[PDB]
Design a protein. Structure first.
Lengths: 353, 353
């Protein structure tokens, strides 16, 4: 049948797992939008897999490109009618953007945050950077505070291009803040921000999470936040080490996981690492909580090379799910060394480096 | 000294795991509200554990019961001051109630649902029943439809005091519906509802999920929904069997899991069952998505016997998180017979039976 031929054609182009649902998700997204960035967004499939599906549909005559937009052909409209694939409806809450939390009480914080981060360091390609919107950062504080994880708590920030530590300083909630980053620009900027605010209880240092954390970072914190790369190795280096910073049971962890650069097959492996290797429980998984500001190095990335139509994104297409985890009896972090180079950031499903 | 004495006293009263965070969660909730049901709600700890913590604090002189409110004593205010335990903040979106989806576009469906469910069967004690609000039922449809899991899909409903199958019939989205329940009253009510709507593509049958599902249920459906009891046996009998109804990879499952009757230790156990035994991925975990209507048999339950302040709830205190799961390569369900009595519903963490 029609669908077997499509799936077979997609498997020729990628090693990323392909199911009938993969094809449905892309076809549903195409009926909603012709923008290739938005098709990745609305399908919730990883970009390289979406490209393979779009290329397969293009080759078999189910889609055409017109004005740099992917549209269903006559044969494409027959296919979606035959298989009952409608356009993907969206009922995301317009007030909270689907975040579950409203930031009406943090209007002063948002205002202060925007002004102090006016000249924030722009995203570096080498360190897989892309900062979230000011509204996302404030929503993170609201979320973390609503779960009782900030007020009088010792908070660890593993990597901080998002400048969550700056928002945490302005909130006045933590007892103390620890923040690290491989990028010198961010540690200097956060130090400058702390000096301007007059914030005493912050420890800032440069560090490569390829190395094991020193003793002063281990077993001494109540909450951690990180927004990591999505190789399984990077999950251990960022989230795993984040769990190692926590004192013991009853401590929290916050991090983003995309559908843009991780398939649901990798989600299963990531969740198995969390539940089996680190013994933590996942308390929340919130769709598109984090909205990322578009990054200037887009044209130098794998995504730009892969895409059949190459136009700079016109909106914030890239989003991630917010994970919350909590430690229990028998939880543990990651304390071993990692020696990979670019494979920390890059795998078959990644495209934004 | 202070906290260890409390933790030791709680461990004498229950075998449910107790951490310092358990005590913090309850004390934070006490500061926000004196209502015992609201303390269970805001603490997000299971009811019997909350009872043990409250009774321990009461005996050690930290709380008192005044006008049927759990209030902090002068010693209690010193305790929360000493450990830096603030009152639990909450920034839950007032438009969607934290559900992530709004039901503005389903106002007609809500009106139709309320009309046809005026004389719905009231919740029976023996089958652990309590139906969600009509707003919740419509929100479920919006959520499931937004992820592409209803339109032209074959949907299985394992247990339906919530009457999700009636809402699904009214929506006109499914290709067909299959629904089962142990309660004859509900199967007959859905029958009468189906004949009243003139809905042809629904199969209704009475069934005990202790038994393995028959041939015609297995591997023929795209989506399932269930709202199960929270013993590990019940998760296998409801959610596991739900997974067994799904055709293969790329199929969806929806279910509620409470913090009211399951500790986070049991959440880790349940998540391990989902990821390791069934091999499914968890795509969403949304806090307090399901709001339950208070049930008339409350005074006959374990909760009433445990509560140190015996007053009926004044609001819908009982809520559950919405889980979404998806099947992948190598996912499988549960197909064995279970031989248990009341232990299907009851364990040490349960209290609403
Ligand atoms: C992955 S992007 C999130 C943050 O992590 C930082 N980061 C990237 N790689 C590393 C690393 N190996 N060690 C520490 N921080 C890193 C980036 O500079 C950014 O601020
Ligand atoms: C657990 S409450 C959710 C729904 O499941 C139903 N239910 C409870 N126990 C069983 C069982 N053993 N088999 C099938 N359905 C059940 C109830 O009647 C209710 O409608
Ligand atoms: Fe909302």
């Amino acid at each position: 049948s029609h669908m077997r031929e499509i799936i077979e054609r997609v498997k020729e182009k990628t090693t990323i797992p392909v199911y009938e649902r993969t094809i449905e998700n892309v076809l549903s997204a195409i009926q909603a939008s012709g923008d290739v960035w938005r098709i990745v967004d609305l399908s919730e499939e990883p970009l390289p897999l979406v490209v393979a599906v779009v290329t397969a549909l293009y080759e078999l005559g189910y889609v055409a490109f017109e004005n740099n937009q992917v549209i269903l052909t006559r044969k494409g409209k027959e296919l979606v009618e035959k298989y009952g694939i409608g356009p993907r409806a969206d009922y995301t809450c317009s007030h909270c953007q689907g975040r579950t939390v409203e930031i009406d009480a943090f209007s002063e914080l948002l205002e202060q945050f925007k002004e102090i981060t006016r000249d924030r360091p722009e995203p570096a390609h080498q360190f897989d950077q892309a900062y979230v919107t000011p509204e996302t950062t404030v929503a993170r504080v609201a979320l973390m505070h609503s779960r009782g994880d900030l007020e009088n708590k010792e908070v660890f920030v593993l990597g901080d291009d998002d400048l969550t530590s700056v928002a945490l300083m302005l909130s006045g909630l933590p007892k103390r803040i620890a923040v690290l980053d491989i990028d010198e620009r961010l540690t200097k900027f956060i130090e400058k921000a702390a000096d301007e605010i007059g914030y005493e209880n912050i420890e800032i240092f440069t560090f490569d999470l390829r190395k094991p954390l020193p003793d002063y970072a281990l077993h001494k914190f109540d909450t951690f936040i990180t927004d990591p790369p999505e190789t399984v190795e990077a999950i251990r280096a960022f989230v795993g080490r984040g769990i190692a910073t926590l004192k013991g049971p009853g401590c929290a962890g916050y991090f983003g996981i995309t559908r843009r650069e991780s398939s649901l097959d990798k989600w299963r492996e990531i969740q198995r690492v969390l539940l089996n290797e680190f013994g933590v429980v996942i308390t929340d998984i919130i769709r598109n909580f984090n909205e990322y500001v578009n990054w200037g190095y887009v044209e130098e990335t794998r995504a730009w090379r892969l895409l059949p139509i190459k136009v700079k994104p016109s909106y914030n297409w890239y989003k991630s799910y917010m994970f919350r985890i909590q430690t229990l009896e028998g939880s543990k972090g990651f304390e071993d060394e990692i020696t990979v180079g670019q494979e920390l950031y890059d795998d078959e499903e990644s495209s934004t480096t």
